[PDB]
Design a protein around this ligand. Structure first.
Ligand SMILES: C[C@@H](N[C@@H](CCCNC(=N)N)C(=O)O)C(=O)O
Ligand SMILES: C[C@@H](N[C@@H](CCCNC(=N)N)C(=O)O)C(=O)O
Lengths: 208, 208
């Protein structure tokens, strides 16, 4: 038995290996691989057959793929003790004067954020590409970030997460080859991962 | 003022943003970017000028680059409470029967590990490409990992690190363009990052 998974770091760093450790605990003869790649390379892995399952940021070219989706609101991550931690939610103008940690310029997620805060004076920001970099900077008191909740979950013991007043789609995809035969093991992983993902998001106030 | 950095996730996830948050705390007008990329893409970023500084796994093609180095022994990461946590050091045969979390097949680091344990019976392993995935799996009790200490440092509160009896080179590179004019800001970052990296490694028993 062999299972090969490819995912972006947002999930490959924290959520997916937490799940994988549950999945395999009683499958001692299941050979597994879990590759952290950029989403673009996640797709190329699934298409070339180098990976059975892919997890990638949305959106992607869906041609040769079977694609399941999750959309969740992005959350605001702020350092412990920040003025904003004492709020029910965070609006664009609450961010005025703050150093904002931004995702990478030109990505769909980054532009959604940038559009939601088009009404505030732009200060010098920090640009990153990994959600985990942003969350580490938040933890260090360097600024605040609007991020996908999947990554944020690994930091809830050391930063504060608050809902944003504006819905910013933080979508990722579970990706399969459109070409292929049924796979019991793949159907099981994907299915249980959703249950596991949905449980965590709902139990932390990040999903309906 | 603008600073652009590209690094592999092993450093871009944890160490580099910890440092960046110190570097910028009193530079409110310094525009910074910190991109997590695969090492191969880290080099392409530095060569094309899309990044001023690169941090990448060793080794790389050194042609158009100025390259500074750190080599440190890889450490063994084991779950809290593991039998091996009670040892001064871990040898190859101490790993017999353990589920080993391996780096990606065919990489120089992965083959160094695999060579150091050629004398043990091979059991089904878990293959990953990010050190943070491996360390998360260790934390979950899924197995043990031989990893670069740079990444391991972000987990010392939740796993146990022990020296390996065999020296496995865990090298990374600070990378600059061979083409260019002096840069005060780049010289400062790199210099202080080394001081910061060296401090942490020495203060955690991971460097001489
Ligand atoms: C860089 C990488 N994605 C980020 C997350 C990007 C923001 N999240 C999102 N769009 N859902 C990561 O894995 O940390 C990618 O290009 O795949
Ligand atoms: C996948 C990525 N490097 C790993 C670390 C690989 C093992 N460490 C090492 N060889 N020093 C990471 O960033 O987690 C790279 O290809 O750049």
């Amino acid at each position: 038995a062999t299972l090969r998974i490819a995912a972006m770091p947002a999930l490959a760093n924290g959520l997916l290996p937490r799940f994988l450790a549950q999945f395999i605990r009683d499958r001692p003869n299941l050979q597994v691989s879990l590759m952290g790649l950029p989403s673009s390379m996640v797709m190329e892995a699934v298409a070339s057959g180098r990976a059975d399952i892919g997890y990638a940021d949305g959106p992607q070219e869906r041609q040769g793929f079977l694609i399941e989706t999750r959309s969740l609101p992005a959350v605001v991550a702020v350092p412990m003790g920040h003025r904003l931690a004492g709020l029910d939610r965070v609006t664009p103008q609450d961010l005025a004067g703050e150093r904002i940690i931004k995702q990478e310029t030109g990505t769909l997620f980054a532009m959604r954020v940038e559009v939601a805060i088009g009404g505030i004076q732009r200060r010098p920001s920090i640009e990153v590409s990994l959600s985990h970099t942003a969350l580490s900077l938040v933890r260090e008191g360097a600024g605040i970030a609007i991020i996908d909740p999947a990554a944020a979950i690994e930091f809830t013991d050391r930063i504060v997460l608050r809902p944003f007043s504006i819905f910013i789609d933080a979508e990722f995809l579970e990706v399969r080859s459109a070409i292929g035969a049924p796979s019991t093991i793949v159907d099981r992983f994907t299915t249980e991962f959703w249950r596991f993902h949905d449980d965590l998001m709902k139990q932390n106030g990040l999903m309906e």
